[PDB]
Amino acid sequence: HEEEDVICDGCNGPVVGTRYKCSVCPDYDLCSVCEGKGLHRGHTKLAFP
Ligand SMILES: [Zn+2]
Ligand SMILES: [Zn+2]
């Protein structure tokens, strides 16, 4: 079966918990740590659980 998963573009790891997906770029996501460290911070992101 094809499983769906969100890999953080900052630490190449999985996105567990809050997903911060960029509203500008296509297909860009950050985990809470990379988001909290200011990666990709000038683009608006959708923070959903
Ligand atoms: Zn990360
Ligand atoms: Zn972006």
Numbering used by the authors: -3 to 45
List sentences quoted exactly from the publication behind this structure.
Therefore, we determined the structure of the ZZ-domain in complex with a variety of N-degrons comprising three type-1 N-degrons and five type-2 N-degrons. As described for the R-BiP complex, two aspartic acid residues, Asp129 and Asp149, bind to the α-amino group, and Asp147 forms a hydrogen bond with the first peptide bond, which means that these interactions are conserved in all different N-terminal residues. However, the side chain of the N-terminal residue of the N-degron is recognized differently. The side chain of Asn132 which undergoes a conformational change plays a critical role in interacting with the first residue of the N-degron. The bipolar nature of the side chain atoms (O and N) of Asn132 allow for the recognition of positively charged type-1 substrates as well as type-2 substrates, and especially N-terminal tyrosine and tryptophan residues since they possess polar atoms in the side chain. The binding affinity between the ZZ-domain and other type-1 substrates with histidine or lysine residues at the primary position showed ca. a 10-fold reduction, although it was still significant.
